[model samples]
Target: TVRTRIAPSPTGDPHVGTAYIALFNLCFARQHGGQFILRIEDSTRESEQQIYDALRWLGIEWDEGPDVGGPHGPYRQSERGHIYKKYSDELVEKGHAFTCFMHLPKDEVQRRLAAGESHVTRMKVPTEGVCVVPDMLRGDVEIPWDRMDMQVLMKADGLPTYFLANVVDDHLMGITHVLRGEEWLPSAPKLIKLYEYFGWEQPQLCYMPLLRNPDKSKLSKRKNPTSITFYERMGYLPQALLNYLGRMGWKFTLAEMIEHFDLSRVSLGGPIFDLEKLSWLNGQWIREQSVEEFAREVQKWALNPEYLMKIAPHVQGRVENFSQIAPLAGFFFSGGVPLDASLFEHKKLDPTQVRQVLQLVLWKLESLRQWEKERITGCIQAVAEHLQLKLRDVMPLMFPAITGHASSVSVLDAMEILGADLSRYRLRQALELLGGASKKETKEWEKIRDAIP
Candidate 1:
């Protein structure tokens, strides 16, 4: 039987994006009497288990996962470290891979990042070699094997890199077709090369365009609520979530795909995830939902006791009463993230100081730990110390730099706490608003550098 898996990194909330892909894979597998497996790619250490629990709670079932053990037991990527390491060793001995010594920053090349130089074991791609990748949906695309970067199969920490782990796990677990979003396309050539090295026949690659926002931008929290929680909090029915996403890139004179979307019918072009449209469609599904169905979906898709427990300690006292809990967590309540301008209020910063803080904060945040609170706090404190200013003064300017405000709590702390993408986005926007922290700020920073510790 054909087997397919949707490997999602347990980072934050269960994203609608994850469900979007999972829905199609499930359809494909179910149609062919195949098993639809879910593998938690928990290779990233910082991701929380609450995320793993959240996805399952959302009515997205899997044949194999952390909770559901199968023949391919220990489905989490973290649990299969030895599998990847063994394959990496095998590949190295065969001269298909090499031990690379490039020590690069995480910002430059995270697993999700298209590029970077971390100390990793890289494979040597063949010169003058062209790798042809056949896609069932999109046909043959030739990748020149020589131009690809030497990929790392394992990191210095002895953990398996994504490429090695993916191939090893997918092969051993009997995955025939690797179906994923097109953002993974760039890594395709390198993975193909690795498969050749292992003497393992590469699986047929199926790439689908990413879900886009209404403006054709990638689905993001800024443009719209991208989390599965967002849809849940909005009280969108699960059927509606699936139905609306089903109608994303495809249309019909009759509402067939809207009514009867199947995996084979899902297209390659990215579907725009429009919140306004989604809200409207959600209302339609809600109107059609039976009371019992609505309740079941809500309890299953929206609320996770574990997630509540995680946030409760932080927010419990802030709630006026038990009923007021949702409103108090304005940040956590739903998708309407407040325009936190409080961070921009630096009591010490004249426009010049504002510029100074922005410059340093941007550079520091970009280079700080991926998602650790203490590391972020320490980095910001270091920057504050370097300028001989109190962290309170320096961090406020960072709030505006990061969240378009001047009175935020801890700049780096908030960013790491909020997450990399959002913190980076807020910082980027704030920089744009603050005139992009120009050469004027650079000069100001230099002047302060000479005068201050």
Candidate 2:
């Protein structure tokens, strides 16, 4: 039986690019009457749960995965370290892999393994060969073994790296068809080498064109709001979300996409993720939805007690009546709040100082261990101290960046509601308004930020 799988990382929000990749795999499998499997790339269980929540929201189902039971146990890669070690150990015994101590000496390699010193397993690349990856979409991709470096198979901590783990997984999990993004094409030679070492039948590879922005550049979370949760929170219907995505690299509705799906027929030119196009499609879906059902959807979108409970306390004290709630709390539903450089002006600090506060705080929050209110509060306070400014001076500057209004809610309190993902995005948005701390100025600010007590 033919089977396909997507082993996705759960390190952050589920992006639309991943959604696009998975949809193709899902539709292709269904067209062929094959099973689709979902695997979680190693990460925290909390973030892993988030991926499950978002993917399920798009009606993306797998025959065997996190929610469903199948013969293949241990769906998440985090649970399968023992399995990876076993394979890498086999590759080492077979002379297809080796323990590298090149930093020290060959003598230390044996000594480190014996004494449990730092050591990692690396692939033993062939000196002379042309590895032709049989990609279903783009005929055969040829890469020379001599040009490729011997990638690490296992990390110092004893678990296999993705290159080894995924190869072992797709082989073990019975994944006959493997679909990945265009950027992964370069790594195919390394992955195919693992298959040769094991003498295993390699799965057919399909490198799908990457998702693109309107400007034709690669769609990424760094430059774009690509999170699946972002769209979901924006209140796009699941049917509309699927329909719009179904049109990615193919001109078809959800049903027609599955029926007419062909791996080779997929457009090589990247699909543009235009919001204007999505809005039109979403409006169409909304019109088709029943008025009563749409009312419930509104509740599910943001009006639910879950979101309200988090938001109410922040806005409640500022408002005396129900009518005032929307004005005060609307930023919670906002993507990125508009702001001007003038809003960041403070009597105590120059524009650059305010930009530094926002930029350094974003970087500090990136490394924060916890996303709790107390931690977020301390992080902001720490940024102020790093800049040698009063907390009051710094706090006002953050208001316009965070909630888009200078007086609605306490910026730190609002940050606790916005989440680490969005808080950082808005910080970035505001920094850009001030020309991103002027780039040349950021390096100096980074030094002070790191020198924090």
Candidate 3:
């Protein structure tokens, strides 16, 4: 039977990269009537839940995983430490590996031992000639023996390093195809040597191109919101996200993705993770869903009963029926308030004063400690008093900046429900839109807003 696996580390927030790789593995497995495996390489007690969450959020499934024990149980590398140790020991016994006692000064050795440390076991590399790595994506590549280091298999903590654990687990777990990112292509020679040493057949290696930012640089949290949680919170549908990721390398319908997915079809160039393209795709998917269908999905996406209750009282008596909830409360669940130049226009407030009021609001809210409704109301009221105006005068000016709508439920109540951080961020965003408050004219306003008791 054909088998493929995706091994992801539990280091931090589950990345969109994980979903990208998982989607391919799932499609490939389903196409061939095989098993798709999800293995946790480095187990962290906290992040395993997030790892599972991210895959499920993208609608990716695995036939065998840490959660679902298979014939080859204990899917986590940390749980299979002893299995790795046994293989390392066998390699040493067969003269394929050796212990490295790289000498340190007597004082240093004592210090290391005192800190509960020991030396690592290193793999024996060929002293002469070259090792060739056969890859499916890239043609056979050769590595000189002298250029390679005697890789450390076991660390000081008695835990197997990635080099040892990955090879051993793949062989033991009966993985047939090893599909991973291009980053692992360089290590193919070492893995190939391990398979040769064990006299075991090497799995077919397929390296998918990396995802890039619009600038064509590697995707990062700074360049893009790499976290799957970010996309979830931004209210992207699972099918939309999956479709977007699939288009990064290949374009197809949902059925075509499973039927025509071939490693040979993958492009060599990096896939650009363009937000505009993703947003367009998201809009297309969203338009297909009915109000009832979309509302049910959004409730699952942002399942906060407390937040729902907070919004209920504001839209009460405003809506004739439940169909009105999505249009009225959408801003609450959305990524950010959708703002335009037209939304800034006010009947009673001047354009300049609206900007000034927003600048003052931004400065005061920056240092706010309490986020309660009363505290937020008093802060805005104080800002109005400082400007020598009434709360009634400032409300009309501030409403558009906060909610991107001139008419809504109570302004202060909405801010409280949105929470202080998001509220402050939206106001700051508005100030930037209105010619920015960083200039000489509004410079003094900063001090005035900061000085408020």
Clash number by candidate, in order: 15, 0, 0
The runs of at least 3 residues in candidate 3 whose Cα sits more than 4 Å from the true structure, single-residue gaps closed, are: 103-117, 127-129, 251-255, 303-306, 310-331, 337-453
Would you list the rank order by lDDT, best first?
2, 3, 1
Task: For candidate 3, write residues 251-332 as lDDT tens digits.
Answer: 2455677887777777789989998888888988888869898888877866669678878888986888989878877778
lDDT of 1 by residue, 1-453 (tens): 878888876655567777777766765666667888887766344444655544554555668777668988678886764777787778867767665654445453455234443455777777787877776677897878667776677887878766777788888888877878787876688888777777786777888779988788888764565666445555566556666666773422123432454556666777777778877877776667588877776565435674456556666655568887555433432323344444455566676566566566656655553558776777667778887787776655555554333333344544544565455555556655555555666776766545432
- State the displacement of the C-alpha of residue 277, model 2, in Å, after optimal TM-score superposition: 1.8
Would you list the clashing residue pairs of candidate 3? none
lDDT of all predictions: 0.64, 0.80, 0.78
Global lDDT of model 1: 0.64
Better of 1 and 2 by lDDT: 2
TM-score of every candidate:
0.65, 0.90, 0.69
